[PDB]
Amino acid sequence: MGEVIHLNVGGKRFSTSRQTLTWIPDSFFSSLLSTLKDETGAIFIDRDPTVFAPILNFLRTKELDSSLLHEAQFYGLTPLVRRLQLREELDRSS
Protein backbone atom coordinates (compact mmCIF):
# COMPACT_ATOMS: atom_id res chain seq x y z
CA MET A 1 0.00 0.00 0.00
CA GLY A 2 1.05 3.55 -0.84
CA GLU A 3 2.91 5.22 -3.67
CA VAL A 4 6.66 5.95 -4.02
CA ILE A 5 7.24 9.39 -5.54
CA HIS A 6 10.52 10.21 -7.26
CA LEU A 7 11.42 13.86 -7.41
CA ASN A 8 14.04 15.76 -9.35
CA VAL A 9 14.51 19.13 -7.68
CA GLY A 10 16.62 21.30 -9.95
CA GLY A 11 18.81 18.31 -10.81
CA LYS A 12 19.04 16.63 -7.38
CA ARG A 13 17.07 13.42 -6.92
CA PHE A 14 14.90 12.53 -3.93
CA SER A 15 12.54 9.61 -3.32
CA THR A 16 9.71 9.72 -0.81
CA SER A 17 6.11 8.62 -0.27
CA ARG A 18 2.85 10.25 -1.32
CA GLN A 19 1.94 10.30 2.40
CA THR A 20 4.99 12.37 3.28
CA LEU A 21 4.24 14.93 0.54
CA THR A 22 0.53 15.29 1.31
CA TRP A 23 0.01 15.34 5.11
CA ILE A 24 0.13 19.16 4.92
CA PRO A 25 -2.95 20.18 2.99
CA ASP A 26 -3.20 22.87 0.29
CA SER A 27 0.57 22.93 -0.28
CA PHE A 28 2.62 23.08 -3.43
CA PHE A 29 2.90 19.29 -3.22
CA SER A 30 -0.82 18.78 -2.58
CA SER A 31 -1.49 20.50 -5.92
CA LEU A 32 1.38 18.75 -7.67
CA LEU A 33 -0.02 15.33 -6.78
CA SER A 34 -3.77 16.05 -7.05
CA THR A 35 3.01 18.00 -14.02
CA LEU A 36 6.45 17.99 -15.60
CA LYS A 37 8.58 14.83 -15.56
CA ASP A 38 12.18 14.14 -16.53
CA GLU A 39 13.62 11.38 -18.74
CA THR A 40 13.37 8.92 -15.87
CA GLY A 41 9.73 9.69 -15.07
CA ALA A 42 10.59 11.60 -11.88
CA ILE A 43 8.44 14.63 -11.09
CA PHE A 44 10.48 17.76 -11.84
CA ILE A 45 10.49 20.69 -9.44
CA ASP A 46 12.15 23.76 -10.92
CA ARG A 47 13.78 25.08 -7.73
CA ASP A 48 17.23 25.23 -6.14
CA PRO A 49 17.67 21.95 -4.22
CA THR A 50 20.09 23.47 -1.70
CA VAL A 51 17.64 23.42 1.21
CA PHE A 52 15.28 20.73 -0.11
CA ALA A 53 16.94 18.01 1.96
CA PRO A 54 16.04 19.63 5.31
CA ILE A 55 12.50 20.36 4.01
CA LEU A 56 12.04 16.71 3.02
CA ASN A 57 13.41 15.47 6.32
CA PHE A 58 10.98 17.69 8.22
CA LEU A 59 8.11 16.26 6.17
CA ARG A 60 9.34 12.77 7.07
CA THR A 61 10.21 13.17 10.75
CA LYS A 62 7.86 15.99 11.77
CA GLU A 63 10.83 17.63 13.58
CA LEU A 64 13.27 20.39 12.67
CA ASP A 65 16.91 19.91 11.71
CA SER A 66 16.67 32.28 6.43
CA SER A 67 16.56 30.41 3.13
CA LEU A 68 14.85 27.40 4.72
CA LEU A 69 11.96 29.58 5.87
CA HIS A 70 11.65 31.20 2.46
CA GLU A 71 11.52 27.83 0.66
CA ALA A 72 9.03 26.49 3.20
CA GLN A 73 6.85 29.51 2.45
CA PHE A 74 7.11 28.89 -1.28
CA TYR A 75 6.05 25.27 -0.91
CA GLY A 76 3.22 26.33 1.42
CA LEU A 77 4.37 24.06 4.24
CA THR A 78 2.27 25.69 6.92
CA PRO A 79 3.45 23.98 10.14
CA LEU A 80 7.12 24.22 9.11
CA VAL A 81 6.75 27.94 8.38
CA ARG A 82 5.08 28.39 11.75
CA ARG A 83 7.68 26.46 13.74
CA LEU A 84 10.54 28.31 11.98
CA GLN A 85 8.94 31.72 12.69
CA LEU A 86 8.41 30.72 16.33
CA ARG A 87 12.06 29.65 16.53
CA GLU A 88 12.86 33.26 15.63
CA GLU A 89 10.45 34.48 18.35
CA LEU A 90 12.16 32.22 20.89
CA ASP A 91 15.52 33.82 20.12
CA ARG A 92 14.41 37.46 20.46
CA SER A 93 16.26 39.70 22.91
CA SER A 94 13.84 42.55 22.26
Curated annotation (Swiss-Prot):
**Superkingdom of origin organism:** Eukaryota
| BTB domain location | 3-65
Tissue specificity as recorded in UniProt: Widely expressed.
Q: Which organism is it from?
A: Homo sapiens
Whole protein: which stretch is covered? Answer: 18 to 120 of 707
Subunit details for this protein?
Answer: Monomer. Interacts with CUL3; interaction is direct and forms a 5:5 heterodecamer. Interacts (via PXXXPR motifs) with SH3KBP1 (via SH3 domains). Directly interacts with cathepsin B/CTSB.
Provide the protein name. Answer: SH3KBP1-binding protein 1
Give the family from UniProt: Belongs to the KCTD3 family.
Q: Where in the cell is it found?
A: Lysosome
Q: What does this protein do?
A: Inhibits CBL-SH3KBP1 complex mediated down-regulation of EGFR signaling by sequestration of SH3KBP1. Binds to SH3KBP1 and prevents its interaction with CBL and inhibits translocation of SH3KBP1 to EGFR containing vesicles upon EGF stimulation.
